[PDB]
Structure 1
Amino acid sequence: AITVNTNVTSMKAQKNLNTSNSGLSTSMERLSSGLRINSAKDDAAGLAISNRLNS
Protein backbone atom coordinates (compact mmCIF):
# COMPACT_ATOMS: atom_id res chain seq x y z
CA ALA A 1 0.00 0.00 0.00
CA ILE A 2 2.82 2.39 -0.91
CA THR A 3 1.73 4.48 -3.88
CA VAL A 4 3.17 7.58 -5.54
CA ASN A 5 0.25 8.44 -7.83
CA THR A 6 -2.63 9.17 -5.42
CA ASN A 7 -2.58 10.62 -1.89
CA VAL A 8 -6.03 9.99 -0.43
CA THR A 9 -4.76 11.13 2.96
CA SER A 10 -4.20 14.55 1.39
CA MET A 11 -7.65 14.49 -0.21
CA LYS A 12 -9.37 13.92 3.14
CA ALA A 13 -7.10 16.47 4.82
CA GLN A 14 -7.90 19.12 2.20
CA LYS A 15 -11.66 18.79 2.74
CA ASN A 16 -11.38 19.28 6.50
CA LEU A 17 -9.32 22.46 6.05
CA ASN A 18 -11.90 23.88 3.64
CA THR A 19 -14.72 23.30 6.13
CA SER A 20 -12.81 24.98 8.97
CA ASN A 21 -11.90 27.96 6.77
CA SER A 22 -15.50 28.48 5.64
CA GLY A 23 -16.77 28.40 9.22
CA LEU A 24 -14.21 30.99 10.27
CA SER A 25 -15.23 33.29 7.41
CA THR A 26 -18.96 33.18 8.16
CA SER A 27 -18.36 33.96 11.84
CA MET A 28 -16.41 37.14 11.07
CA GLU A 29 -19.12 38.69 8.89
CA ARG A 30 -21.78 37.98 11.51
CA LEU A 31 -19.55 39.70 14.07
CA SER A 32 -18.65 42.60 11.77
CA SER A 33 -22.30 43.55 11.17
CA GLY A 34 -24.21 42.17 14.15
CA LEU A 35 -26.89 40.19 12.34
CA ARG A 36 -27.43 36.45 12.40
CA ILE A 37 -29.56 36.43 9.24
CA ASN A 38 -27.24 38.18 6.80
CA SER A 39 -28.44 36.27 3.73
CA ALA A 40 -31.09 33.69 2.92
CA LYS A 41 -28.61 30.93 3.79
CA ASP A 42 -29.97 31.08 7.35
CA ASP A 43 -33.53 30.88 8.68
CA ALA A 44 -35.80 31.26 5.67
CA ALA A 45 -38.80 31.89 7.92
CA GLY A 46 -36.87 34.24 10.20
CA LEU A 47 -36.27 36.90 7.56
CA ALA A 48 -39.91 36.81 6.46
CA ILE A 49 -41.11 37.32 10.03
CA SER A 50 -38.54 40.05 10.65
CA ASN A 51 -39.75 42.00 7.62
CA ARG A 52 -43.26 42.32 9.06
CA LEU A 53 -41.85 43.16 12.50
CA ASN A 54 -39.68 45.80 10.84
CA SER A 55 -42.80 47.25 9.22
Structure 2
Amino acid sequence: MIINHNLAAINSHRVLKFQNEEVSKNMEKLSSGMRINRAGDDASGLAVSEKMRTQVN
Protein backbone atom coordinates (compact mmCIF):
# COMPACT_ATOMS: atom_id res chain seq x y z
CA MET A 1 0.00 0.00 0.00
CA ILE A 2 1.26 3.46 -0.95
CA ILE A 3 1.30 6.01 1.85
CA ASN A 4 2.47 9.31 0.32
CA HIS A 5 -1.00 9.86 -1.18
CA ASN A 6 -4.51 8.59 -0.45
CA LEU A 7 -6.37 8.32 -3.76
CA ALA A 8 -9.61 7.15 -2.14
CA ALA A 9 -9.49 10.20 0.13
CA ILE A 10 -8.94 12.49 -2.87
CA ASN A 11 -11.84 10.99 -4.82
CA SER A 12 -14.16 11.15 -1.81
CA HIS A 13 -13.16 14.76 -1.14
CA ARG A 14 -13.82 15.76 -4.75
CA VAL A 15 -17.24 14.14 -4.95
CA LEU A 16 -18.11 15.53 -1.51
CA LYS A 17 -17.11 19.06 -2.53
CA PHE A 18 -19.25 18.95 -5.67
CA GLN A 19 -22.17 17.44 -3.74
CA ASN A 20 -21.85 20.26 -1.21
CA GLU A 21 -21.86 22.81 -4.04
CA GLU A 22 -25.08 21.23 -5.32
CA VAL A 23 -26.45 21.41 -1.77
CA SER A 24 -25.71 25.13 -1.64
CA LYS A 25 -27.29 25.67 -5.06
CA ASN A 26 -30.49 23.97 -3.92
CA MET A 27 -30.47 25.73 -0.55
CA GLU A 28 -30.16 29.26 -1.92
CA LYS A 29 -33.19 28.79 -4.18
CA LEU A 30 -35.07 27.15 -1.31
CA SER A 31 -34.46 30.33 0.69
CA SER A 32 -35.35 32.63 -2.21
CA GLY A 33 -38.42 30.72 -3.39
CA MET A 34 -37.70 31.38 -7.08
CA ARG A 35 -36.64 28.80 -9.65
CA ILE A 36 -33.74 30.93 -10.95
CA ASN A 37 -31.90 33.67 -9.06
CA ARG A 38 -28.47 33.92 -10.71
CA ALA A 39 -28.34 33.98 -14.49
CA GLY A 40 -26.99 30.98 -16.37
CA ASP A 41 -29.41 28.53 -14.75
CA ASP A 42 -31.91 29.57 -17.42
CA ALA A 43 -30.84 32.61 -19.45
CA SER A 44 -33.81 32.48 -21.82
CA GLY A 45 -36.10 31.89 -18.85
CA LEU A 46 -34.65 34.91 -17.05
CA ALA A 47 -35.09 37.14 -20.10
CA VAL A 48 -38.66 35.94 -20.63
CA SER A 49 -39.41 36.44 -16.93
CA GLU A 50 -38.08 40.00 -17.02
CA LYS A 51 -40.27 40.73 -20.04
CA MET A 52 -43.24 39.15 -18.26
CA ARG A 53 -42.66 41.26 -15.14
CA THR A 54 -42.43 44.45 -17.19
CA GLN A 55 -45.69 43.45 -18.87
CA VAL A 56 -47.53 42.82 -15.59
CA ASN A 57 -46.32 46.11 -14.11
Sort the TM-score into its range (normalised by shorter chain).
0.7 to 0.9
Per the alignment, residue 35 of structure 2 pairs with: 36
How do 1:4-43 residues align onto structure 2 when only pairs under 5 Å count?
Answer: 4-43=3-42
Q: Aligned residues, how many?
A: 54
Q: What is the TM-score when the length of structure 2 is the normalising length? A: 0.84
Q: Aligned-pair distance for 1:41?
A: 2.8
Give structure 1 stretches of 5+ with no counterpart: none
Q: Aligned-pair distance for 1:49?
A: 0.6
Root-mean-square deviation (CA), in Å? 1.0
Identity of aligned residues (%): 41
Q: What is the TM-score when the length of structure 1 is the normalising length? A: 0.86
